[PDB]
Structure 1
Amino acid sequence: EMVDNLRGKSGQGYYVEMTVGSPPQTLNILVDTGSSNFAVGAAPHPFLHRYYQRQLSSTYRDLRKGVYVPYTQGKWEGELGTDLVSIPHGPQVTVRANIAAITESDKFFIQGSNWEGILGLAYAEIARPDDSLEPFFDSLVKQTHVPNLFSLQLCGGSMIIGGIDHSLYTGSLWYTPIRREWYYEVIIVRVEINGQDLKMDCKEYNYDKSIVDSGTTNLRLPKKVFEAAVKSIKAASSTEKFPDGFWLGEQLVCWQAGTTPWNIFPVISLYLMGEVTQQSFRITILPQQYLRPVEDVATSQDDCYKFAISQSSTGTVMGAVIMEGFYVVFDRARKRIGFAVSACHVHDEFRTAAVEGPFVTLDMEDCGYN
């Protein structure tokens, strides 16, 4: 009953239906593994179809404390409280959870996204105001019999709470350790483009950190890695030349509908640390993943895309365009993240996104930045 309980797209977010308060108020909530605050619009906003009305809830409790949360994109401020929360198409439980009632925001809510709040699924260590504010999933596990694990299949899609759904993936699940429990932090040990090693000290791939983040759209790479990746992708696709603004993820590239030259763009392989010493596995990303379709009726004589790999100063972010096509298991109980090929895959007749291994490495360097 949890299958297909997500709607949305990489550019605007994937969301699940939830209820808050007594009696239940229904809201669509973006699923975000890149933060740890549960927050909902709680006052009118031009882009909100509905919002949390605290005065209508008999179970609302004000915590008499404000909270401010800045993201890479957008920020909001609100008032902390607790109330009853349920997930109509998830586990049939009700939990009392912390909720930030958003009273002001900037560039956070997205016009037409159809969601009104955000569910931070990461760990308390990055919750605001601080780690004393128990995140929703922690409350869910404490208050119910739900196993300490969830999985995401972003396509709509599915959030499976408390378990793994075999119908949602094919082949084997490969696991990489969660290096530290704050973000879902992982370690990348190698990057290839078209099979060619970027040939970089592997700490560079994780400079600062690397995280798995359903709330970010792009694959975001540390500047040094980003520049090297663009150089390699340019070289592979050199039979066509694009403006610098395309590679900067600013402007669209368009082709006559149906004629997108997928074959001239390379596959990207990200090798993740395995659960055994010096062992790794790789996930492979097709251009159908990293060239993000931009729907616009005005341009619809063409298919147009944005380059969805971009620069970061805060480490690697494996965003939604990376997670799409994979089934991703956030195995909190065992401190690991699993990857498998998703049942909803976009591969043409020549290449297929993959999760595969094992691979071994001779260089004993720890790739974590620290």
Structure 2
Amino acid sequence: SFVEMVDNLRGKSGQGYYVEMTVGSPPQTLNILVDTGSSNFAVGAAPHPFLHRYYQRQLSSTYRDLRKGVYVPYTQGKWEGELGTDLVSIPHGPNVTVRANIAAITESDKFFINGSNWEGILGLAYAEIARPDDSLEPFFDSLVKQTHVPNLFSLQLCGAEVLASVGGSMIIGGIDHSLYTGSLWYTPIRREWYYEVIIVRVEINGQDLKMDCKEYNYDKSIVDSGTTNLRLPKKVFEAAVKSIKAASSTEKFPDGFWLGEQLVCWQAGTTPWNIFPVISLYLMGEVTNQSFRITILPQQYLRPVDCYKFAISQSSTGTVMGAVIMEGFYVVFDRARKRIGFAVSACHVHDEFRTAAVEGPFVTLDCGY
């Protein structure tokens, strides 16, 4: 049924991708953020200025209360709510219904986004980082256990007066070959909590940043559909921008732009893409001394707002390969074989001079924290 899953994601630029889901009986429709960077199925369950609809447990005849609260403070914001289980389906995903854990958010701070058009989050990472603890089975774990859907899903994020709308596909239970060209290269999932991986080398315009590879994964590297930007450890970030500033020297910008909080504009197809360099991330291969590179264009790391924001930013929590990396590629979260596959996406955005690429192997003769 993969055909019926194609284009089942939507979103606004910089505000995440969501898939339609129903919870409860009768089905309550909600748009839910696909988030490989968290592990809770958490849905607005009380009025909020940014929510135009929300999950109403009392309207559901199949809701069961777990009589347990959950409080999820985090760096940027916070949500808090009540644990229960209910029946869940994805209308444009696998044709099944599962009983899953649901965090019904009763209060939250800076969690929902104005105009994003989603009402909850589908944390697709592992139990290890779930709240309140790893005993709360994540949605995908329940789905696999209760149905026969293979332990694998794949994301094809396609990107783009009003924020640009983005489209994409979440294929659960398999690999849709029409979604990518060329070969799928796999990098090991180093540990099952976040989707943690290892970056062994990075180049800006073919030039090695030449760092001890531990800096690339300090203190970890993760694949996160719930983060817009490519986020880099401080020391790598600074080296990245310096290298990027040099490659686009002709024509200058204010460091408010480089700090990713200040847009820059051209007008109608005048954008000097060729000025900015490609960025290659080399991920560890399944074979010890091998790696492969994913190369991403400026079209990915300059996010549209013809105005663009610099979608590479600093991190104190390690490297985050967010949406702007994923948008060049078809990304397979092969949980069954503890690996993540990358292929050129059938939908990636590129000129007649450059193209996002996935290429290997590269042999590199210790990179993890």
Same fold per superposition (TM over 0.5): yes
In the TM superposition, residue 70 of structure 1 has moved relative to its aligned partner by: 3.7
SS where residue 266 of structure 1 aligns? coil
In the TM superposition, residue 33 of structure 1 has moved relative to its aligned partner by: 0.1
Alpha-carbon deviations, 1:15-58, whole Å to 9, x = none? 00101011111111000000000010001111111000011111
Evaluate the alpha carbon distance shift between residue 106 and residue 6 of structure 1 in structure 2; reply closer, same or farther with a 3 A threshold: same
Alpha-carbon deviations, 1:260-290, whole Å to 9, x = none? 1101100000000000021000000100000
Evaluate the alpha carbon distance shift between residue 180 and residue 351 of structure 1 in structure 2; reply closer, same or farther with a 3 A threshold: same
Find the aligned partners of 1:325 and 1:94 in 2 and give their Cα distance. Answer: 31
Task: Determine if the alignment matches structure 1 residue 367 to structure 2 residue 367.
Answer: yes
Task: Determine if the alignment matches structure 1 residue 350 to structure 2 residue 325.
Answer: no
In the TM superposition, residue 251 of structure 1 has moved relative to its aligned partner by: 0.7
Task: Determine if the alignment matches structure 1 residue 88 to structure 2 residue 91.
Answer: yes
SS where residue 266 of structure 2 aligns? strand
Find the aligned partners of 2:15 and 2:197 in 1 and give their Cα distance. Answer: 24
Q: Structure 1 regions of 5+ residues with no counterpart? A: 294-302
In the TM superposition, residue 72 of structure 1 has moved relative to its aligned partner by: 5.1
Find the aligned partners of 2:348 and 2:12 in 1 and give their Cα distance. Answer: 14
Evaluate the alpha carbon distance shift between residue 9 and residue 71 of structure 1 in structure 2; reply closer, same or farther with a 3 A threshold: farther
Alpha-carbon deviations, 1:120-162, whole Å to 9, x = none? 0000000010000000000000000000000000011100000
Evaluate the alpha carbon distance shift between residue 16 and residue 105 of structure 1 in structure 2; reply closer, same or farther with a 3 A threshold: same
Find the aligned partners of 2:42 and 2:267 in 1 and give their Cα distance. Answer: 42
SS where residue 139 of structure 1 aligns? helix
Of residues 15-24 and 66-75 in structure 1, the stretch that sits farther from structure 2 once superposed is 66-75
Evaluate the alpha carbon distance shift between residue 4 and residue 121 of structure 1 in structure 2; reply closer, same or farther with a 3 A threshold: same
- Alpha carbon RMSD of aligned pairs, Å? 0.9
Find the aligned partners of 2:333 and 2:153 in 1 and give their Cα distance. Answer: 5
Find the aligned partners of 1:16 and 1:142 in 2 and give their Cα distance. Answer: 21
In the TM superposition, residue 308 of structure 1 has moved relative to its aligned partner by: 0.3
Alpha-carbon deviations, 1:93-133, whole Å to 9, x = none? 11111000001111111111111010000000000100000
Find the aligned partners of 1:177 and 1:10 in 2 and give their Cα distance. Answer: 29
SS where residue 342 of structure 2 aligns? strand
Find the aligned partners of 1:223 and 1:208 in 2 and give their Cα distance. Answer: 11
Of residues 8-17 and 79-88 in structure 1, the stretch that sits farther from structure 2 once superposed is 8-17
Find the aligned partners of 1:329 and 1:317 in 2 and give their Cα distance. Answer: 17
Q: Decide whether the 8 Å contact of 1:280 with 1:359 is kept in 2.
A: yes
How many residues matched?
357
TM-score of the aligned structures, taking structure 1 as reference length: 0.95
Find the aligned partners of 1:279 and 1:99 in 2 and give their Cα distance. Answer: 41
Alpha-carbon deviations, 1:173-197, whole Å to 9, x = none? 0000000000000000000000000
Find the aligned partners of 1:334 and 1:72 in 2 and give their Cα distance. Answer: 32
In the TM superposition, residue 73 of structure 1 has moved relative to its aligned partner by: 4.1
Of residues 129-138 and 105-114 in structure 1, the stretch that sits farther from structure 2 once superposed is 105-114
Find the aligned partners of 1:88 and 1:269 in 2 and give their Cα distance. Answer: 37
Q: Structure 2 regions of 5+ residues with no counterpart? A: 159-166
Evaluate the alpha carbon distance shift between residue 182 and residue 267 of structure 1 in structure 2; reply closer, same or farther with a 3 A threshold: same
In the TM superposition, residue 9 of structure 1 has moved relative to its aligned partner by: 3.8
Find the aligned partners of 1:102 and 1:72 in 2 and give their Cα distance. Answer: 18
TM-score of the aligned structures, taking structure 2 as reference length: 0.95
Evaluate the alpha carbon distance shift between residue 71 and residue 32 of structure 1 in structure 2; reply closer, same or farther with a 3 A threshold: farther
In the alignment, which residue of structure 2 is the partner of 1:150? Answer: 153
Find the aligned partners of 1:170 and 1:95 in 2 and give their Cα distance. Answer: 33
Find the aligned partners of 1:69 and 1:252 in 2 and give their Cα distance. Answer: 32
In the TM superposition, residue 200 of structure 1 has moved relative to its aligned partner by: 0.4
SS where residue 66 of structure 1 aligns? strand
